[PDB]
Amino acid sequence: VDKRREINNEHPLLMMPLYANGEEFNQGKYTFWGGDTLTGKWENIPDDLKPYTVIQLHPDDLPKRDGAARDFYEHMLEEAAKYVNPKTGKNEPIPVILTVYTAGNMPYYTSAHWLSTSWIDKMYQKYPNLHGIFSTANYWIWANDIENKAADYLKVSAKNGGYFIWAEQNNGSAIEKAFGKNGKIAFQKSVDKYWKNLIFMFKNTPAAEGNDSTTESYMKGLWLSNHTYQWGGLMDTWKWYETGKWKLFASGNIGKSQGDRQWLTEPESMLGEEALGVYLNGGVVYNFEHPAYTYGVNNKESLLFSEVIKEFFRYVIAHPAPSKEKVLEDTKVFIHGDYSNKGNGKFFVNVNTDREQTPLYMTGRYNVIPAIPGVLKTDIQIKEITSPEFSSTQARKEYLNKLYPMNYEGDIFAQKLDNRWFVYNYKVNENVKQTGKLKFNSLEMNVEFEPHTYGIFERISNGLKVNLNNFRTNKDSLWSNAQDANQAKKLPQLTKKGAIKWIEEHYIKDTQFGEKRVTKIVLRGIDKLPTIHSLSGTNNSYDQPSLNFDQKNHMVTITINSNGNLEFELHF
Numbered sequence: 001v002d003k004r005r006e007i008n009n010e011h012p013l014l015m016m017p018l019y020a021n022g023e024e025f026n027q028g029k030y031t032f033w034g035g036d037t038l039t040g041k042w043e044n045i046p047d048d049l050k051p052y053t054v055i056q057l058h059p060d061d062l063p064k065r066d067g068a069a070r071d072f073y074e075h076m077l078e079e080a081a082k083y084v085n086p087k088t089g090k091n092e093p094i095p096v097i098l099t100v101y102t103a104g105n106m107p108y109y110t111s112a113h114w115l116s117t118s119w120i121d122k123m124y125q126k127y128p129n130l131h132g133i134f135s136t137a138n139y140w141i142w143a144n145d146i147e148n149k150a151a152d153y154l155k156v157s158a159k160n161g162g163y164f165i166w167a168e169q170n171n172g173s174a175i176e177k178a179f180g181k182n183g184k185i186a187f188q189k190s191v192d193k194y195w196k197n198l199i200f201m202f203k204n205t206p207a208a209e210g211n212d213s214t215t216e217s218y219m220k221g222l223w224l225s226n227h228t229y230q231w232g233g234l235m236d237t238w239k240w241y242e243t244g245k246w247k248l249f250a251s252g253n254i255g256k257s258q259g260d261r262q263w264l265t266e267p268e269s270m271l272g273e274e275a276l277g278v279y280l281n282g283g284v285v286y287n288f289e290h291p292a293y294t295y296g297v298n299n300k301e302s303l304l305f306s307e308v309i310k311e312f313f314r315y316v317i318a319h320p321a322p323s324k325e326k327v328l329e330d331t332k333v334f335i336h337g338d339y340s341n342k343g344n345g346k347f348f349v350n351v352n353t354d355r356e357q358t359p360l361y362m363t364g365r366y367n368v369i370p371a372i373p374g375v376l377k378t379d380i381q382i383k384e385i386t387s388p389e390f391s392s393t394q395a396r397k398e399y400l401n402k403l404y405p406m407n408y409e410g411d412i413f414a415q416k417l418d419n420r421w422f423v424y425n426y427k428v429n430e431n432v433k434q435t436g437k438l439k440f441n442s443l444e445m446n447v448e449f450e451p452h453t454y455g456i457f458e459r460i461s462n463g464l465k466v467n468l469n470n471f472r473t474n475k476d477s478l479w480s481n482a483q484d485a486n487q488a489k490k491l492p493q494l495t496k497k498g499a500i501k502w503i504e505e506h507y508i509k510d511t512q513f514g515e516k517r518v519t520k521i522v523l524r525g526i527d528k529l530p531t532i533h534s535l536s537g538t539n540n541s542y543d544q545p546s547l548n549f550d551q552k553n554h555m556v557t558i559t560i561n562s563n564g565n566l567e568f569e570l571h572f
């Protein structure tokens with residue numbers, strides 16, 4: 001019964017995936033795609049982050065036959081268990097999560113098919129450093145006994161004080177079915193008993209189907225109604241492939257034709273905009289794909305990891321996400337029903353998202369409206385999804401607008417928590433600047449942001465603390481030689497091996513950094529020229545900010561030219 005680790009707002013969790021190389025396994029070698037090693041990867045994790053990071057082993061393309069995944073996993077669990085801090089000579093077992101269920105555990109899709117619950121129990125009993133087990137990405141192959149197996153995984157985890165972590169997306173009603181929509185109620189009953197050992201996450205890979213907002217809505221509602229211990233999200237740069245995009249801002253769709261160029265192209269900073277929707281809504285668990293771009297290769301951090309993910313995750317440790325109690329206080333509307341019966345992701349389009357195919361929000365006015373599926377009992381206005389208020393886009397806004405007041409101006413995403421305004425430009429692949437006006441009591445702040453830019457503005461006793469991130473390297477080189485979508489589509493494949501090699505040779509080193517680009521901050525109601533203090537950020541990525549003080553108009557324009565992360569205080 002005693003939990004093997006804490007997972008909550010004060011103890012968030014960053015999953016650190018390591019994918020087995022099946023080809024090398026057949027040759028009797030135990031290696032991961034991308035050249036990370038279990039020991040090397042752990043060692044390279046910053047020490048301040050080690051208490052909040054867990055290695056997630058994934059069986060990837062291990063042989064699809066009995067014994068392959070057990071063999072590889074036992075080998076790795078041994079390595080984790082016997083690790084010695086280099087250093088202090090102490091045996092310090094590396095915490096691990098095993099991926100045990102994926103692709104419906106179909107024998108034609110995954111070696112994970114041949115990991116029995118009996119075997120998992122044995123592993124939990126042998127390895128105290130095994131902290132949880134992971135199911136991921138079954139929406140597209142919703143196997144006959146998936147709910148029965150999920151109940152078994154939750155129970156075996158609870159039996160051992162571990163966590164069952166499930167990353168899933170509401171495609172084909174997956175989240176609704178999980179809890180009993182179609183009559184498979186084993187997991188519903190398991191959760192009644194064992195929800196304290198459950199973590200539920202979204203998995204935003206299938207971006208063409210547009211279920212980001214409804215899945216995240218459920219994740220948050222399930223948490224608030226005690227149907228999961230904590231929640232979070234797996235954010236996946238493959239969304240760029242799923243939606244058929246190519247060169248940044250280029251016109252034309254290439255569909256699903258250049259996978260390995262496409263998962264490299266999502267702007268680095270956009271992952272932080274996605275991760276804000278988790279943080280701002282009380283979520284505390286984070287995971288990413290494709291691992292080579294989002295984390296790195298060869299036991300080294302990629303620039304996406306170092307400049308965006310690591311900074312962001314350090315931020316949510318230093319400033320714990322809002323507690324359940326606080327999210328629950330702030331919630332004005334809680335939806336009960338199946339989004340699959342109301343157009344799915346379309347439910348929120350032109351309410352708080354700008355389109356079907358996006359992982360971002362266009363306003364923070366309602367934050368994320370929480371919901372649970374209609375199969376669950378209840379158990380703040382709790383509203384049936386079939387209410388007249390939800391019948392249309394306009395009904396939704398009118399009803400919501402009475403309970404959630406407008407608290408900023410401008411066509412841009414912004415949400416406030418205590419003394420802090422969180423802002424981002426919500427454009428995905430369109431080069432449009434956005435502006436907003438935010439207030440901290442009597443201090444008025446305007447911002448102008450280009451796409452793929454987020455900021456956190458905190459009112460402090462003597463001024464304003466600013467953290468900015470617009471890190472976005474230039475990916476055009478991947479799309480060289482293609483003057484349009486037709487030509488792009490016909491490029492020679494980068495391939496998986498080729499994309500790992502591109503990261504090694506052109507991203508880890510010889511990086512094509514993006515151009516510096518302008519952010520404006522305008523303060524109004526100001527007496528004196530403010531001064532800048534504690535200025536730091538990504539090495540070689542910013543000019544000294546320029547200020548223009550208009551004394552008569554009690555305003556100052558701050559102009560920033562940068563491409564990276566940045567922080568400073570303004571005193572006034």
Ligand SMILES: CC(=O)N[C@@H]1[C@@H](O[C@@H]2O[C@@H](C)[C@@H](O)[C@@H](O)[C@@H]2O)[C@H](O[C@@H]2O[C@H](CO)[C@H](O)[C@H](O[C@H]3O[C@H](CO)[C@H](O)[C@H](O)[C@H]3NC(C)=O)[C@H]2O[C@@H]2O[C@@H](C)[C@@H](O)[C@@H](O)[C@@H]2O)[C@@H](CO)O[C@H]1O
Pocket residue numbers: 019033058060061102103109110136137140205206238239241242289290291496
């Ligand atoms: C019909 C079909 O082939 N299935 C698609 C899924 O993935 C494939 O099938 C499973 C069984 C695996 O064999 C996987 O390797 C296949 O690609 C899709 O799931 C993810 O989809 C993206 C595309 O959006 C990728 O295929 C991704 O896998 C690739 O990247 C990961 C790292 O991010 C690994 O490097 C994989 O080896 C690589 N695959 C290939 C062929 O290069 C898929 O993610 C993987 O598989 C899923 C099921 C899950 O286990 C993840 O944790 C894992 O990373 C799905 C997308 O909606 O579409 C299916 O049609």
